[PDB]
């Protein structure tokens, strides 16, 4: 029944060392200037986070290449099998079905 006590040791040793390093000398008796100087070298920066298109398409493109490796995941379990002409010719399909999705998008990526 240790899996599950194989990690709750590891996280309660993790959260131990945080509060002892951070929070315990955070109650110390120094002067502790609380003035708004804590931000470094970008003093005010009175703006909202602007949209960047070339850093959105990187999120979606990965997600659609991430799905069909989980289809591709039970290939070693698909070895000790019955009829294997089917198993080979279907395994080669998905990879090409992943490969074409490159080549269409490959004619327009952008400065990624």
């Amino acid at each position: 029944m240790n899996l599950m006590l194989a990690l709750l040791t590891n996280f309660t040793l993790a959260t131990l060392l945080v509060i002892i390093a951070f929070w315990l000398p955070q109650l110390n008796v120094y002067s502790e200037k609380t003035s708004p100087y804590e931000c470094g070298f970008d003093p005010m920066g009175s703006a909202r986070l602007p949209f960047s298109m070339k850093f959105f398409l990187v999120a979606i493109t990965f997600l659609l290449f991430d799905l069909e490796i989980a289809l591709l995941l039970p290939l070693p379990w698909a070895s000790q099998t019955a009829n294997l002409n089917t198993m080979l010719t279907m395994a080669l399909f998905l990879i090409i079905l992943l490969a074409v999705s490159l080549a269409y998008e490959w004619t327009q990526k952008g400065l990624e």
Partner: protein, 319 residues
């Protein structure tokens, strides 16, 4: 004797000797003496590093540092020999686990009312408080009145100062409030009867001294510092949370520098607005500062931009 402009790097005649001068009250004095320029001999107790932010005040050879225990005689008889004035502000809050706290306001202002008095000084100055009364309060608030009385025997003319309660920049008085992000906001003691006192601004108390340090003719004539406009309410504690929107200690932490489950909860609410025949601030001119102008600055929590200030008080009554 003086010479030239008093901006920096002048002579200005005076040679002070300011004891203490590390805390919130003692430091901010020396800043205005490191401007007009004078041999401000500052001795310190046991702090080599904690006094380092004091050195870009004395120009070059203006200030000078010495070590001194306080109870021994000659350690405070070696710096007082070449001087013109000497002011005292030594002391603390709660009794320490090494000292005795009783004669520390009696023998120790007398230990520098020793041959210090004899050697030829003048304009020796001590401090008071507007609430230190020999009636039965408190262990700190009275036994300061011993220092008002038992040290008055020597130096029969001092101009001991009696400032009001202070709000400032790095202080402890107002900062004892709004540091109560805690399991509850408990006032003293769920009542708004005598709140509030006179929160004089710390630039005025350090401007009263430097107008008295060459006044002249202010010896023996003790002074009491007027506060802001005008009295105040319990609305203060509501006003502190209005805009806030809810040294040399140790290496890791000092395990005892507390909030004092003792007299300290009532060491500030005993008000005793004292005699208005004391002269005491405006005649030591010229200074009169409110609270609602300098209230934005020292109160500072996690909003840090948006204030939208409109909170105020009428006078309050008995104004």
């Amino acid at each position: 004797i003086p010479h030239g402009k008093g901006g920096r790097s002048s002579v200005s005649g005076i040679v002070a000797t300011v004891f203490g001068a590390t805390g919130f009250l003692g430091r901010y004095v020396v800043n205005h003496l490191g401007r007009m320029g004078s041999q401000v001999i500052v001795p310190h107790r046991c702090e080599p590093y904690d006094t380092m932010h004091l050195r870009p005040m004395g120009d070059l050879g203006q200030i000078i540092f010495m070590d001194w225990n306080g109870r021994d005689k000659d350690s405070i008889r070696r710096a007082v020999e070449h001087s013109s004035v000497v002011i005292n502000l030594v002391g603390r809050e709660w009794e320490t686990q090494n000292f005795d706290f009783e004669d520390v306001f009696v023998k120790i202002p007398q230990a520098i009312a020793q041959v210090s008095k004899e050697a030829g000084v003048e304009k020796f100055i001590h401090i008071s408080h507007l609430n230190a009364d020999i009636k039965s309060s408190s262990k700190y608030l009275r036994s300061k009145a011993v220092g008002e009385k038992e040290v008055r025997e020597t130096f029969p003319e001092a101009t001991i100062i009696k400032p009001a309660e202070i709000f400032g920049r790095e202080d402890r008085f107002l900062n004892y409030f709004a540091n109560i992000r805690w399991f509850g906001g408990v006032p003293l003691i769920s009542l708004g009867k005598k709140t509030v006192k006179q929160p004089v601004y710390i630039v005025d108390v350090t401007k009263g001294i430097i107008n008295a340090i060459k006044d002249p003719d202010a010896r023996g004539k003790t002074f009491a510092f007027v506060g802001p406009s005008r009295y105040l309410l319990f609305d203060l504690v509501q006003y502190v949370f209005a805009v806030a929107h809810r040294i040399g200690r140790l290496f890791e932490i000092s395990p005892f520098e507390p909030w004092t489950t003792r007299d300290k909860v009532e060491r500030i609410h005993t008000t005793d607005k004292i005699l208005p025949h004391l002269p005491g601030l405006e005649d030591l001119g010229v200074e009169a500062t409110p609270l609602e102008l300098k209230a934005i600055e020292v109160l500072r929590r996690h909003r840090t931009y948006r204030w939208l200030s409109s909170e105020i008080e009428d006078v309050q009554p008995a104004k």
